[model samples]
Target: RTAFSSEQLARLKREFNENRYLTERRRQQLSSELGLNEAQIKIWFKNKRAKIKKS
Candidate 1:
């Protein structure tokens, strides 16, 4: 996939950093609430985590 917009990527990083969407269960629930599929949420979180570890 192409790189996401800075704003969108920032929001995804914020969501991952926040305790609200930390767990897989929470991620799935938030994805449903946000009208996104679980897989998207998982991918975003994975990318965010990798970014964090890289920095």
Candidate 2:
């Protein structure tokens, strides 16, 4: 599990709301801004999608 701030959550949701699928460039961009690994961002989106689906 990752620790998230409200700001981080908001940005992630805003990005996810804009684009469900991310390109390599976008993944790297978010990783840089969020101070997370690219793999972590990838997994976050994956888990987020699953969470919404499950709900």
Candidate 3:
């Protein structure tokens, strides 16, 4: 299992809230823009989606 720092989580939330939805390719682009690795962005989105689903 992977864990995100508070800052990572906050960044993920900001992206999710701002975009609502993002495609895998688009996400990779955003991740690059954020200076994050693609895999990290993928994980962040996965975690963000789970939280959104729960809500």
Candidate 4:
């Protein structure tokens, strides 16, 4: 499997830091705007919340 680019990660993480939740509309927007599969954002946020829980 492949990962996002540095810039893409930067943008996503920036959005992450802004808010911990993602609405469907927002997720859809990010999927098209950021050029990534919608599921990736969902998975990434799931992992993020898991890590945050332990931290």
Winning candidate number (lDDT): 2
Can you rank all candidates by TM-score, best first? Answer: 4, 2, 1, 3
Alpha-carbon RMSD, each predicted model: 3.2, 1.1, 2.7, 1.0
Candidate models: Cα lDDT each: 0.68, 0.89, 0.74, 0.86
Worst 10 residues of 2 by lDDT: 1-10
For candidate 1, write residues 1-55 as lDDT tens digits.
Answer: 6455566556666776675336877877766666667777787777667777889
Clashing pairs in 3: none
Task: Name the 10 consecutive residues with the lowest summed lDDT in model 1.
Answer: 1-10
lDDT score of residue 28 within candidate 1: 70
lDDT of 4 by residue, 1-55 (tens): 6588998788788888988789998788888988998899888888888999999
What's the lDDT for residue 23 in model 3?
87
Cα shift from native, residue 50, model 4 (Å): 0.7
Better of 1 and 4 by lDDT: 4
- Badly placed stretches (over 4 Å) of model 3 are 1-11, 18-21
Q: What's the C-alpha lDDT at position 28 in model 2?
A: 95
TM-score of 4: 0.87
- Output the TM-score of candidate 1: 0.61
CA lDDT, candidate 1, residue 21: 37
Expressed as tens digits, the lDDT of each residue in 1-55 for candidate 3 is 5566677668777878887677877787777766777887877678778887999
